[PDB]
Amino acid sequence: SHHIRLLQQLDEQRQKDLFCDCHIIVEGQMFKAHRNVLFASSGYFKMLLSQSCRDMGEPITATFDVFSADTFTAILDFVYSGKLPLSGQNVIEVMSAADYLQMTDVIGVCKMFIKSSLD
Amino acid sequence: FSSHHIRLLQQLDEQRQKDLFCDCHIIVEGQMFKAHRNVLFASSGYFKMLLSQSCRDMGEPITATFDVFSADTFTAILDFVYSGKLPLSGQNVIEVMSAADYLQMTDVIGVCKMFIKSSLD
């Protein structure tokens, strides 16, 4: 119960722009999140944020142009909730953006959605 | 229950052990504790109030000092924040619950209250 409650409050912080030390700019859209959460949930951010892992001050700004803003929205919502809204239209786009960000958990969820829909 | 929640909190604890993204230092009984501000803000009413002034300002790590409870008492509480497991026994169940109401942590109080009701029944 503690885990579910904590992540809901962590999701509330990024919505209210609280303790957001990381800015993600995808398709010209701004996304606010926490550095310690992205470092722990994505292999790409583990490498990108490793340089300034102990230095605090200016929020680290990251830019992406390889996936859409709606695709990153479903991925970023999964990080702060554990729920990934998958459908026949975005299952391939989300899974394709997941391996670039090196998120093995998202890839497995998208792969399971395909196996279920195909059966 | 969900694996994503369990996995994330385990990695957050690894960061605090390795002093990664730790923008908050807690000094209790002369012992140094490193942790994250966003995690403490979400798990404690006191830290929600303490970090509310610098919730959007980043820079110098916020240092918090406590002298009303011991370092071993705060260790069990801080470990519960980064794991969800609270080792309770007859020696520290009252000290942890007393320190929980000080930090305004209703979740820790409920665990101690459930631990007392179970042992006596």
From Swiss-Prot, chain A:
Subcellular location: Nucleus
Residue ranges of domain BTB in the record: 20-88
TM ranges: none
Function: May be involved in transcriptional regulation.
Protein name per the record: Zinc finger and BTB domain-containing protein 8A.1-A
Source organism of the structure: Xenopus laevis
Lineage, uppermost ranks: Eukaryota, Metazoa, Chordata, Craniata, Vertebrata
Residues of the full protein shown: 5 to 123 of 470
